[PDB]
Design a protein around this nucleic acid. Sequence first.
RNA 1: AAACUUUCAACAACGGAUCUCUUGGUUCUCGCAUCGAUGAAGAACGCAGCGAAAUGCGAUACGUAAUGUGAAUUGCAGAAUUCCGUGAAUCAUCGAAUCUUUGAACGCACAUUGCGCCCCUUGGUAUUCCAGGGGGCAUGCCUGUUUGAGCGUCAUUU
RNA 2: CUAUCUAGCGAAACCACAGCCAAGGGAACGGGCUUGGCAGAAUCAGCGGGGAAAGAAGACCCUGUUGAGCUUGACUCUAGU
RNA 3: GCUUGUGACGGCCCGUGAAAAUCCACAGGAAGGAAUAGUUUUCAUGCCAGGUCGUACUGAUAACCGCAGCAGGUCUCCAAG
RNA 4: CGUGGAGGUCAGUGACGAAGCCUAGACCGUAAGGUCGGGUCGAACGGCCUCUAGUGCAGAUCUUGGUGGUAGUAGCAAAUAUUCAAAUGAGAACUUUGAAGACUGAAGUGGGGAAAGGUUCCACGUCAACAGCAGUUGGACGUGGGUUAGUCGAUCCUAAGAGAUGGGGAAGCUCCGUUUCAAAGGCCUGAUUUUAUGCAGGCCACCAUCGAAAGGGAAUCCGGUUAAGAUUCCGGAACCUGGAUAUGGAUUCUUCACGGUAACGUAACUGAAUGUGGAGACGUCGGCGCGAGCCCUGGGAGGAGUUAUCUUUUCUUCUUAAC
RNA 5: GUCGAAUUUGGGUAUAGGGGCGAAAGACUAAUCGAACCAUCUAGUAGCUGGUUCCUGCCGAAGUUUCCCUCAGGAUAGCAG
RNA 6: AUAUUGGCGAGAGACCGAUAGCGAACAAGUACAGUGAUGGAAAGAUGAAAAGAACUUUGAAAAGAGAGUGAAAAAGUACGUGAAAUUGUUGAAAGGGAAGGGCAUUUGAUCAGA
Lengths: 84, 50, 71, 119, 101
Amino acid sequence: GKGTPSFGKRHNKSHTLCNRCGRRSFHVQKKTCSSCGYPAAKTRSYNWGAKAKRRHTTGTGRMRYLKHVSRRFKNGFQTGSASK
Amino acid sequence: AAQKSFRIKQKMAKAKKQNRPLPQWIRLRTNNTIRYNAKRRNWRRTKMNI
Amino acid sequence: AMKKVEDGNILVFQVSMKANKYQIKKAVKELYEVDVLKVNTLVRPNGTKKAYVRLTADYDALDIANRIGYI
Amino acid sequence: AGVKAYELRTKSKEQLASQLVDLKKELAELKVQKLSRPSLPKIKTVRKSIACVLTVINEQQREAVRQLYKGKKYQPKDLRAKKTRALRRALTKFEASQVTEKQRKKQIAFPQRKYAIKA
Amino acid sequence: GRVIRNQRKGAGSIFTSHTRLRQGAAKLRTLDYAERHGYIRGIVKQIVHDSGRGAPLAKVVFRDPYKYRLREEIFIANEGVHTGQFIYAGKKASLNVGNVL
RNA sequence: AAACUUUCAACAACGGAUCUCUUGGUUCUCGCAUCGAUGAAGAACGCAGCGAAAUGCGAUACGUAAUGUGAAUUGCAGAAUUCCGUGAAUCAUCGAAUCUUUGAACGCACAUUGCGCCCCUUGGUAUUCCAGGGGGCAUGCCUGUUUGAGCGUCAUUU
RNA sequence: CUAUCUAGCGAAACCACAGCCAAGGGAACGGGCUUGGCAGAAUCAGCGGGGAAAGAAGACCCUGUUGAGCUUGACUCUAGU
RNA sequence: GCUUGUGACGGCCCGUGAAAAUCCACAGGAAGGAAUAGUUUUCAUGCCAGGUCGUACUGAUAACCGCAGCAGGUCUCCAAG
RNA sequence: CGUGGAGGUCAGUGACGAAGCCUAGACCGUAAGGUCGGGUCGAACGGCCUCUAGUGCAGAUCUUGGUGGUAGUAGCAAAUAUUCAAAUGAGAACUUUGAAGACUGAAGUGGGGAAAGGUUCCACGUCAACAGCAGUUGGACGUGGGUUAGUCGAUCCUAAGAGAUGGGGAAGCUCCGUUUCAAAGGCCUGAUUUUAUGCAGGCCACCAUCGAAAGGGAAUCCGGUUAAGAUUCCGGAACCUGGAUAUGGAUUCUUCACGGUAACGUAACUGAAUGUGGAGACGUCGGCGCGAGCCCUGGGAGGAGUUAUCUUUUCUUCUUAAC
RNA sequence: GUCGAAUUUGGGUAUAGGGGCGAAAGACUAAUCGAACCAUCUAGUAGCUGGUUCCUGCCGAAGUUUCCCUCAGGAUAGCAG
RNA sequence: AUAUUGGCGAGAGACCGAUAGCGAACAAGUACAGUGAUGGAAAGAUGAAAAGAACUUUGAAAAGAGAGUGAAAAAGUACGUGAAAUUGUUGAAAGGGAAGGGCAUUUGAUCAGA
Ligand SMILES: [K+]
Ligand SMILES: [K+]
Ligand SMILES: [Mg+2]
Ligand SMILES: [Mg+2]
Ligand SMILES: [Mg+2]
Ligand SMILES: [Mg+2]
Ligand SMILES: [Mg+2]
Ligand SMILES: [Mg+2]
Ligand SMILES: [Mg+2]
Ligand SMILES: [Mg+2]
Ligand SMILES: [Mg+2]
Ligand SMILES: [Mg+2]
Ligand SMILES: [Mg+2]
Ligand SMILES: [Mg+2]
Ligand SMILES: [Mg+2]
Ligand SMILES: [Mg+2]
Ligand SMILES: [Mg+2]
Ligand SMILES: [Mg+2]
Ligand SMILES: [Mg+2]
Ligand SMILES: [Mg+2]
Ligand SMILES: [Mg+2]
Ligand SMILES: [Mg+2]
Ligand SMILES: [Mg+2]
Ligand SMILES: [Mg+2]
Ligand SMILES: [Mg+2]
Ligand SMILES: [Mg+2]
Ligand SMILES: [Mg+2]
Ligand SMILES: [Mg+2]
Ligand SMILES: [Mg+2]
Ligand SMILES: [Mg+2]
Ligand SMILES: [Mg+2]
Ligand SMILES: [Mg+2]
Ligand SMILES: [Mg+2]
Ligand SMILES: [Mg+2]
Ligand SMILES: [Mg+2]
Ligand SMILES: [Mg+2]
Ligand SMILES: [Mg+2]
Ligand SMILES: [Mg+2]
Ligand SMILES: [Mg+2]
Ligand SMILES: [Mg+2]
Ligand SMILES: [Mg+2]
Ligand SMILES: [Mg+2]
Ligand SMILES: [Mg+2]
Ligand SMILES: [Mg+2]
Ligand SMILES: [Mg+2]
Ligand SMILES: [Mg+2]
Ligand SMILES: [Mg+2]
Ligand SMILES: [Mg+2]
Ligand SMILES: [Mg+2]
Ligand SMILES: [Mg+2]
Ligand SMILES: [Mg+2]
Ligand SMILES: [Mg+2]
Ligand SMILES: [Mg+2]
Ligand SMILES: [Mg+2]
Ligand SMILES: [Mg+2]
Ligand SMILES: [Mg+2]
Ligand SMILES: [Mg+2]
Ligand SMILES: [Mg+2]
Ligand SMILES: [Mg+2]
Ligand SMILES: [Mg+2]
Ligand SMILES: [Zn+2]
């Protein structure tokens, strides 16, 4: 036992999908994601985990709003219209 | 499991829709460094891991 | 689906995944001017929703399909 | 070639709503046709016309609400200027230009003078 | 260099009491005006086994002196106490087996 | 003597070294200060005539509006060439919008696309039930508003 | 049923270079060195003498001013009390 | 006769062998009830609606885990002569 | 001596062929090396004077990648077993069909499910790779189709337990605690109907929420139907919940029923607060009784098998759901 | 060996690393246990092992003295350029 | 005035030139592994232009032989050049239990200088 015969007994998921990060790190019984720390308000990250921080940091997504802030600052956060 | 959550079925549907070869009109585009579908998945080779 | 239309008086629609049976019945009634006997819904393996809408006996689903352009 | 927003801006909201309804009917009939006809690209033009009509309708509604809220404080938040959060929390120009009476008196009495050396 | 078993018992992880089948805490009535000054009569409805306890428990039903309802109490049954027996509890109750004095 | 083994050469193999390329990296310097409850970063799921991805976007979905430029896009199909024009474009710019489900995440929950409450409105006789549409209901704290509690306590009636 | 032969399929361990001995001397037990014996292509099935065969930077022993598990009135402390 | 359900019993315990949602009944008499008329949706019939998500297939000497189409492991129902 | 890069110079070399590479061809140096010829090749490169360094490999059980001998070798030998013909096909030990021989032998190699997988289900086309032989076949490849519920589950309940709030601890991430030292509440209605509302008559809470697809639980069965769905579709026949309801029935002149001694009966046969009780709701084993399904078996009404001989014979249909 | 109760087992749940859990073997705690796994400190230190890349020319040793928690090391003198 | 391995916008280098340089020049924090925390690659180059080989023939087909395009197919998407290990064919040579090497010369082949 403890090898091939015992690997056959693996049919109960310790982790499922996390609502916040989707990594399948949500511990079913602890109700906590081992990756992003959900449902804690802060997102889990550690300075010893520099590679994990770089994997999950700003810019790894599509930056739906942040990507236009630089252009809006360059234009001075104007509010009117181009006025042909 | 035949009794699945909607989240699991939704991920299953996305995997089914993206389980296809590279479209043939690609490989005709101007630069087209893409040769084949490098992200192809099969149930017999790599598990989705949910 | 076309066999169902021809034989069972059932129109087969792809419907919004947010729509329930009340919404599907109301939308079919409004868009096609037919009373709906019964709506059955399933989520297909491709993540879209299919609706089998059996109309009342007063309407021919084949005629409705021909009117709306698919035969 | 689709609808034009400058042509839609000349119409009333009833005409825009009816045009949107006709465009939705046209899109529905076009996606019915798409089942048989292969590679039918008119649905893209119809979709963009629907988008343009909805955009003009929203523009008219928001301009009407802006006129309803003109001049009075507490405009709706989505009608207020969207600067950054810090910029909207920053002191207005009146604040941080406020000075005490003593400071105003002394800065009037002794402002920075203009002086040049001539040797 | 390892935590011993009697040290591990204090954490109460696998060493807690198995209380699922227990009838409830065995307590006398709350010491109230009736028991402080006179007595109150209840009725032994059941003599029942309590899981994890050698002694049987007696379910004694009293009347609530302040609201119209019954108050069931879980006494530890004394030998000779029987169902249907009237139990008297208070300063003025008689010296009889099962009475609370 | 053949075969076989070994050495060398030519050609052909295996393999991808070398050389030459380089829309990449690395380091230095200079300039600037701009995320988020007006919902950020991140995530899930979707969106194209034909796309699996990258990139873009959100049911107005490789996008709408506005401005500039001035005739494209392109792999095919389609459309157009009025294109001497408020007008092509997978253009640039970008100040108006849309922005699914989420997420600090905010009605309560969430291994559920689970379960409520309130307002307006629509249909089914319908204030009560069911359903559709629109708008809302988190916590802590600050200022103010209103309604209150306390023989904590003042005055008055007494 | 293998092993064997055939059709198809087709690895791995290991490999300084390789592979006949005797004695000598030699790091004191050589496949090579010295002196002799000898020595003829290409091979097949077995075999377990040898390759001080392979598998692993010996676990035994010792050294290191290298650890760790455990113990104790070792030294120095410490939670608790 | 086998499988299974059930009934009334009997043996055993220093073991006496869940909880809650929910449903009903009873006590009580608040209240509302008749006479050119009242009561009764626990009687019968009649009308309307019942949303959302899952539903295919394997479940193993090939659909799960064990690097694999691995003699391993992986819970259970039916069960002919 | 040689290498990458840098300053100067040779107005150096070069698509009429730079660099690189191959070359038992030649020359020079003791050597590190340098030079030339020939072939290949295609875009840069060199001599000299200096500067500079990530500057020279045979090893490190070195790193990465590639490749051998072993070697067409070890081997592809558990699970009783395959054979004949035809079809298809270029090609058949392996596909399909037919015939035969066998096995699993109901604690199956059968028919379904839970976890898990995620389209492997089914059809068509199809064999470059995979199926350690093969392949026309496939859980493969390519393109499509397919999962239909008021009644089956989730959803609801609580279990062990998890866990906000009020509070307390902790520098803090957060920890404790789950009714606790809390002003924790809306549903019934007289009156309000200046509005069925707040005030104001009058009744009730030792408490969020999560936690079971095997526990608890409202209600569906039969027949047929697909290539692939079925307690879901179709046909027929029911049931439950929520709501609205109009008749009939019942009751009342003794207003809220009668009968039976009684156990109790009924088509009904008013019933708020509050309280009480029951069901939900329960171990294991043993024998006995009964029911269902299966098994065995008789007659008869059909079909099929054997029939040199015997066998009123062997096998098979004769069924009845929820309500 | 055992096979009807200290029985076997699914699911849910709790206990987490000097911690748990242990009918006690230092056993088990995801092929990891006399202290799991993951990342960082960390390129940890090593008097110890291995390796350490072109040519030619000239010169050319030591294993000895003293001291050291020193005896596989260093300092020192000596030998050498 | 000072700091700034983050963000935005620029200018540069005696830096690296695809086993280098960030892990990632490319659909790179991607594919993939792990229950999880995390771990984490490989992978650039036809040609100026697809002009990406019409057509014929053999084969069931893949492909081959031609033909053709192209400056070049000694550039055929298994694509710039194309080393070595290792391999096939041809040619030459040698070979009684290794092979390889040093000095010297015979023989065969080949070749410079005059
Ligand atoms: K640079
Ligand atoms: K140890
Ligand atoms: Mg283990
Ligand atoms: Mg667990
Ligand atoms: Mg359904
Ligand atoms: Mg948003
Ligand atoms: Mg010898
Ligand atoms: Mg000797
Ligand atoms: Mg030897
Ligand atoms: Mg000899
Ligand atoms: Mg042997
Ligand atoms: Mg031997
Ligand atoms: Mg050693
Ligand atoms: Mg060792
Ligand atoms: Mg020492
Ligand atoms: Mg130590
Ligand atoms: Mg049984
Ligand atoms: Mg099924
Ligand atoms: Mg099945
Ligand atoms: Mg089975
Ligand atoms: Mg597997
Ligand atoms: Mg360099
Ligand atoms: Mg050249
Ligand atoms: Mg050579
Ligand atoms: Mg070139
Ligand atoms: Mg170096
Ligand atoms: Mg080397
Ligand atoms: Mg060396
Ligand atoms: Mg090596
Ligand atoms: Mg290697
Ligand atoms: Mg063999
Ligand atoms: Mg074998
Ligand atoms: Mg066999
Ligand atoms: Mg066979
Ligand atoms: Mg057959
Ligand atoms: Mg047998
Ligand atoms: Mg048999
Ligand atoms: Mg199949
Ligand atoms: Mg094969
Ligand atoms: Mg084959
Ligand atoms: Mg397929
Ligand atoms: Mg049910
Ligand atoms: Mg807590
Ligand atoms: Mg629950
Ligand atoms: Mg159940
Ligand atoms: Mg089926
Ligand atoms: Mg039906
Ligand atoms: Mg009666
Ligand atoms: Mg021991
Ligand atoms: Mg080092
Ligand atoms: Mg000398
Ligand atoms: Mg000393
Ligand atoms: Mg040594
Ligand atoms: Mg790299
Ligand atoms: Mg290349
Ligand atoms: Mg060339
Ligand atoms: Mg190649
Ligand atoms: Mg090449
Ligand atoms: Mg070679
Ligand atoms: Mg020989
Ligand atoms: Zn997460």
